[PDB]
Design a protein around this ligand. Structure first.
Ligand SMILES: CN(C(=O)[C@H](Cc1c[nH]cn1)NC(=O)OCc1ccccc1)[C@@H](Cc1ccccc1)C(=O)N[C@@H](Cc1ccc(O)cc1)C(=O)O
Ligand SMILES: [Ca+2]
Ligand SMILES: [Zn+2]
Lengths: 306, 324
């Protein structure tokens, strides 16, 4: 039973692998090699050399065949690739093969590639290969950063596991406003993010994004941003009341007070580090070093006095 | 999202691990033959962990030097195995082994240099091979290969640095290419790269260090990115990366050691992915390495950058400064 099904495949794998190489040194860049590689690559798309062989036969065949015949050949390659991707969605070689294929054609269908991406991203919202493939296709199709942004919004509200989607927004925002973050844009992004973290306070992804946003903009604090940050602070304390083991809103409280007024809020900041270290003892060394860096900033600020 | 951990091993079993690596490869085995596409790196992992455990001599030097020589192609790149295609990944591994054995002259070093140099692009990136895949992993393979060979000046170093810095993200981390999300594996490759090229001052150590130390789960294991299960190999990359940027103390070290030790197989030797899963040489290397970086005195000290014994690297006069 266990050994039955196990050995059986390994015989047929070694024969196929053996014949492909024999074919290759013999210079037989034909359809028989696609058939033998078809068999091996399905079970093991991480066998890179075999993706190479396939490119080699296709390049060659394109020179012995009508465009119609090679057109047919690329369409079967596309289908082969998709069946491989369904089996193992995270193989570098399979996804690299697909770009090599698409980059090479006279007129690719990029809108249909974008939709293959939307499909795989609904299967696995965190799949980094598919996100990289999506950015590749967006480029080739000259897709505007504004619509990639609209697409990211959809993905965040509809459901969670959003680290990948906030990351993409970190890269799309700076493209909307080329500099060598505007306050209005920043205030918009702040509202979207706090929404997200007062919805799933245990989603670590919006907090990470939030800390970037707190950096991304003093006191040149406008009354609006001042009032928005003060409001974010009160909301985190209320969330703190509800989720007392929540480490992310405690750090954020500290970071928010820093952003507001380091010296005015010195007592509270110190209070908050002890609380935080008690809830997140694995980060106690990180938190001591952060508190030392901040007490030092507080020393420099108090010196600039009269 | 972590492993709840059972009544696993809490003792270092150098004994079994060595036995496991000296006998690995005795030739009909299944996962062995399926792995032929990465054999050269497979051999690097075996040799390194044995050497770190002081048992290099139980492996077959002369046999390996022939194999390596037989895997260099006329372009000068090296393949995973005989008849397989040359790649930056298996070129780095062969050089690491040749450096382990003090035998770099077993291959044509001028041709290895030329090969690595031919894979660099206009923007400074490296492809993995003639088929053009761009990944900061290959930036790490190129500069690590050249440094072991004393030939780092053979590449355009400033454009190489520029490309890697362009893969830095809002969280302090690094991805495959421009725009790619941060991932522990890519961070290791990029901080390694910046280590070799003397550019660690360009890393935001506090920011990245926070991202990295937040990879540790309540079980004590580290994951490679948010929402992922911890494991031994992502535990090595994260820790090594932390050591490179001077922040190894931002992890709970006693909880990491325990996770790593819960990953041993008490019966067969070797280390697994995560507790009680099936063992392999890759995780065996990275577990022993992880433990060495945490301080274990039965294991030789290991370079966080090259994942080889420091005493090997001290011999070839290649030892990058790290942050503190
Ligand atoms: C690609 N990958 C790897 O583990 C591969 C394995 C490999 C196969 N052949 C040679 N190596 N490592 C890799 O590509 O090399 C990076 C590298 C090389 C030298 C020194 C440090 C890092 C990782 C990701 C990664 C990214 C950047 C750097 C490091 C890792 C990967 O995809 N792992 C997969 C599965 C897996 C697990 C183990 C393997 O050996 C191969 C694949 C997963 O966890 O889902
Ligand atoms: Ca020997
Ligand atoms: Zn692993």
């Amino acid at each position: 039973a266990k050994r039955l099904e196990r050995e059986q495949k390994l015989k047929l794998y070694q024969s196929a692998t053996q014949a492909v190489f024999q074919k290759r040194q013999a210079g037989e860049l034909d359809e028989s090699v696609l058939e033998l590689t078809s068999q091996i690559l399905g079970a093991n798309p991480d066998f890179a050399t075999l993706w190479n062989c396939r490119r080699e036969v296709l390049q060659h065949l394109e020179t012995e065949k009508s465009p119609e015949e090679s057109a047919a050949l690329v369409k079967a390659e596309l289908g082969f690739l998709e069946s491989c991707l369904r089996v193992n969605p995270k193989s570098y070689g399979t996804w690299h093969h697909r770009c090599w294929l698409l980059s090479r054609l006279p007129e690719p269908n990029w809108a249909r590639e974008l939709e293959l991406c939307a499909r795989f991203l609904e299967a696995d919202e965190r799949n980094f290969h598919c996100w990289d493939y999506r950015r590749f296709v967006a480029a080739q199709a000259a897709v505007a950063p504004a619509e990639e942004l609209a697409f990211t919004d959809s993905l965040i509200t509809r459901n969670f596991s959003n680290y990948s989607s906030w990351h993409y927004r970190s890269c799309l925002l700076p493209q909307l406003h080329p500099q060598p973050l505007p306050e209005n844009v920043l205030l918009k992004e702040l509202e979207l993010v706090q929404n997200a973290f007062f919805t799933d306070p245990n989603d670590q992804s919006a907090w990470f994004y939030h800390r970037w946003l707190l950096g991304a903009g003093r006191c040149e604090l406008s009354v609006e941003k001042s009032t928005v940050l003060q409001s974010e602070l009160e909301s985190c304390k209320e969330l703190q009341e509800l989720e007392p083991e929540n480490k992310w809103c405690l750090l954020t409280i500290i970071l928010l007070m820093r952003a507001l007024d380091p010296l005015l809020y010195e007592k509270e900041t110190l209070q908050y580090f002890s609380t935080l270290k008690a809830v997140d003892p694995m980060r106690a060394a990180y938190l001591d070093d952060l508190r030392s860096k901040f007490l030092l900033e507080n020393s420099v600020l108090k010196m600039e006095y009269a | 999202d972590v492993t709840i951990k059972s009544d696993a091993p809490d003792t270092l079993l150098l004994e079994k691990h060595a036995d496991y690596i000296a006998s690995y490869g005795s030739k009909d085995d299944y996962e062995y033959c399926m792995s032929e596409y990465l054999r050269m790196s497979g051999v690097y992992w075996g040799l390194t962990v044995m050497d770190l455990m002081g048992q290099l001599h139980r492996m077959n030097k002369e046999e390996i030097l022939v194999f390596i020589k037989s895997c260099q192609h006329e372009c000068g790149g090296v393949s995973a195995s005989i008849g397989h295609d040359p790649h930056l990944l298996y070129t780095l591994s062969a050089v690491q082994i040749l450096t382990l054995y003090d035998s770099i002259h077993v291959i044509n070093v001028d041709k290895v240099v030329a090969y690595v140099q031919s894979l660099q692009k206009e923007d400074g990136s490296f492809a993995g091979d003639i088929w053009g895949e761009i990944d900061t992993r290959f930036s790490f393979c190129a500069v690590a290969t050249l440094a072991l060979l004393g030939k780092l000046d053979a590449i355009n170093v400033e454009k190489a640095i520029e490309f890697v810095l362009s893969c830095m993200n809002f969280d302090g981390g690094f991805g495959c290419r421009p725009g790619s999300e941060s991932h522990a594996g890519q961070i290791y490759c990029c901080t390694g790269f910046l280590a070799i090229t003397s550019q660690l001052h360009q890393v935001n150590s506090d920011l990245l260090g926070w991202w990295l130390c937040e990879r540790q789960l309540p079980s004590g294991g580290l994951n490679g990115r948010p929402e992922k299960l911890p494991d031994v190999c992502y535990s090595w990359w994260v820790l090594a990366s932390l050591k490179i940027i001077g922040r190894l103390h931002w992890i709970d070290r006693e909880k990491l050691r325990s996770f790593i030790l819960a990953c041993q197989d008490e019966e067969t030797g070797g280390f697994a992915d995560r507790p009680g899963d099936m063992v392999d040489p890759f995780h065996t290397l990275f577990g022993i390495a992880g433990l060495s970086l945490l301080g274990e005195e039965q294991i030789k000290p290991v370079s966080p950058v090259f994942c080889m014994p420091e005493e090997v690297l001290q011999r070839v006069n290649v030892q990058p400064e790290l942050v503190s």
